[PDB]
Amino acid sequence: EDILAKLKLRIQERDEALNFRKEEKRKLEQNIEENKSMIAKIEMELPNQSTKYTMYQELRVYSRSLLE
Amino acid sequence: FVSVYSKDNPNMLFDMSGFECRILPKCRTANEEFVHRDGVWNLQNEVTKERTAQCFLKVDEESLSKFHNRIRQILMSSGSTTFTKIVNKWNTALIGLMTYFREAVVNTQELLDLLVKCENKIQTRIKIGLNSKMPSRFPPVVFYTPKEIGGLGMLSMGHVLIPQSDLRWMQQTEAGGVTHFRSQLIPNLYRYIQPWEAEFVDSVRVWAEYALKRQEANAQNRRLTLEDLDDSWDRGIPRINTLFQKDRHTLAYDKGWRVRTEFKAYQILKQNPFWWTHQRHDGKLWNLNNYRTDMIQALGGVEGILEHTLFRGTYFPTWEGLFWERASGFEESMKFKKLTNAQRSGLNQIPNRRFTLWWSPTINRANVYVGFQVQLDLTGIFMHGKIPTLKISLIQIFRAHLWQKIHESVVMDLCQVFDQELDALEIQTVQKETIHPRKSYKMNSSCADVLLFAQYKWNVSRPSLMADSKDVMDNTTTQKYWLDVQLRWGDYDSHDVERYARAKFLDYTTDNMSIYPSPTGVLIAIDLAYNLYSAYGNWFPGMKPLIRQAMAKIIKANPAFYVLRERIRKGLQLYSSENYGELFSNQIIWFVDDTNVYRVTIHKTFEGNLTTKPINGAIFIFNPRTGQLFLKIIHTSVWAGQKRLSQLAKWKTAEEVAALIRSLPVEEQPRQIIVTRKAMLDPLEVHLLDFPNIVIKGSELMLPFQAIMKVEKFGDLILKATEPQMVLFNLYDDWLKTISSYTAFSRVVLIMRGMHINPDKTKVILKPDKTTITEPHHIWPTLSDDDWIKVELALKDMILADYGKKNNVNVASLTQSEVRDIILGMEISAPSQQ
Amino acid sequence: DKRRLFPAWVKPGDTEPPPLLTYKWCQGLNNLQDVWETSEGECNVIMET
């Protein structure tokens, strides 16, 4: 009947190792979504940079001609 | 010794190089057969390809005693010696025994019992060195933990069990509860050294197959491709990687080297354990990196180890990126210069202070045969034994009533929460009690610290934890509620703030001494060593989620914890290691370079020895937006009368540019200075304290301003200077009229990298037609805007060809961003280092 | 070494660490012809001094 007491130990031990992997799952998911969030922000800038640059291409030509 | 094999005597005994050997011809006699002891060699008959006989190894009793006496010598030579120095000698002795004898040791049970005895003795030498005559306060983790985690890094050959209890860790939940976490023997070193049988048979096949792989290299006359051997690299009794040893054009001539290293015993008084090998001829015959990594795993991983240490008291967020300080000045130098045996042993104690402090929650754990509960004065710490230096170390942490100062701060920080929730909790008032100053560390009993009076009573829950999200909230009604806040300083045996908060609550609420003004309240507990928090008691509606939220906010930002945390860190010595478009913005920015400032030339003499002559140099200060260049020549007269010249040269670089900056109007002074050598940041900082508006940044990109000395307009000008004159230049030879600053800037970088590679090929590139000239009012040859592009392409190809030659890579493998970054000198070398 | 003064039995040679020497000994010993035969009373004696 001591084995019954041993089980409560191994039950706690196993459950308490299980706690770590659960948290480990939470940590992995957290990193990915911040990147999803963060990278979502970065690709929103990609249009804006396209709009800038193309306008500068015109305004390069325009200013260079205008001042001459 | 004479040993005789016959039809009567079947064991052919012999004893060579310390290996006691018994041969049994198993084709003849059958007393033992193919038993899987590790240390039995199988004698393959070479012509019949049969296991005709077995050889049983042992370590001979002569070399047992040579080993035993080496451990005795280490124990005798202890005294005032650091624990690291002791175990470094143990490790060296143990590696020496093991890497020599290998599988002979494990067949020699009388050695293994000795190895257990010696290892335990080294441990006990450390235990008694910390005045701790008991097992419990010294569990395995203190010794075997690798020494970059501040353990001793002891190696083992014992079946040293790691207690299953000692692997747990705990982390604070945001809910205010605590989750325990987790992830057997400590590893024997023996499994990490390849046994000699495997080494020999693998050495035959490896060097045999190398001859075939060289026959391919011979047949094709190709380069001996190391890619053909990368699986073989750490094989062979001579390690095959010694074939590529850069010294090997000499090591071919060091003949008779093995006997030479043995006769050193008559020449050098210091015994050498690796007398039998030489890393340049044998190669390194063992590699123990896997032992270090696996040892962390056996001890529970970094999170499981660090609970045994005061790390959680630092409240660093993570272990990675932390480092341990060393300097050797004052630690060792002053003891060499000004020895005094009774006093200067306190300097040798500096690592032991750090070590004992670091392992405090283990070495001062309450689980003891005896000890005493010596409470530290003015403090809640208990000092269960007279551990030599932990007492003074902890006093310096909690100096000047820090224990009380913490407790009052958390009590009043709670007041500043209650003062803003009165109506929501239906509180008529909250009282900070007249807490007696002892109360913060009188551990045997307590008062209420904060008292709540209801507006018209609340219903009140049965006693429960802050982690218990559900409550029997209709159990009773009461209109007075108390909070008791109790600090704690845990140890690895006891830092569970959940069970602590319960047990102290249940005790005090039944104890007669407890000055509690109501039958219902909570006890709040804080483990100040682990930064854990908890609460237990009765709860009225809205109280539990407030304390849960409020307590975390306190732990995150309270100032009294911060001064404690810094004191722990400053005691542990343990510290944390913590743009291309910007150059052309409307600010004023100077690049500065110090590499050309102090220069020395070498020549032969009539004495045959060389001698050093200093020569004139220059500080190089360049504005990349405007192209303006300030070339402050530094003349050899400033080195006269001094000998610490290199540090003086660093000081004089920062000083002379500060003198220039201080003379110029603030509308022309920089606002950022970008410095091409990180060693120059700090003398500039201490010199530019008078101008806080200037930010100073390390360049991190590499700009080769050292190469400008190859330009004759600079070389002769700087060499032939008679005084430390200033010379002003512009590197943009009118380019800012016809091209932009960036391409003009990039052109300078292309030209500078070019002449750093080769001036003359650059001059060839800069002279595409022989009719081109350099005008005296210019620095570069006069070229058209398209001709400048043509020479830029030649410089770009020249840079990449030199890069490709230096790295064995095709230029066509490089993208437009990579070739740019190569021009910027960024760290492109391998993907494993970015 | 160039002139081959020492014959190959002179040990602390550059090519064997002493544990390999023990191996080449017992490897070379076992390779001897009829070395384990004792039918007619043949004996091996190894002498070390």
Place this chain on the structure above:
Amino acid sequence: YSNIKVIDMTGKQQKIYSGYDSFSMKLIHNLNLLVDLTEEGIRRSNQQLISLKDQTTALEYDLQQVQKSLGTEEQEAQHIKDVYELIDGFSSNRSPSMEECQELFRRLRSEFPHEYE
């Protein structure tokens, strides 16, 4: 400080000044065109950074597949059963008759054979 030779080669004809003090007390439309030209490189640098961000998704997306979905969730699923198996093994026991012992060891040995041994 006040009497150290300054040689000036920045202009088309040479000048000499007695020192820093004598030196220290001795368009923008075109400049802005140069600025305009630089901004073209800025988006070029950012597009290349966006290519690195593109590879950053490859790192992140393989962490989803390999690290979270395969490695973590699989070992989760296996051992979380083993917890409940071992809890179930604990549940089985107590005060049997003869046939209750048979059903116990039938149950224990058939269902939980590793734990039984």
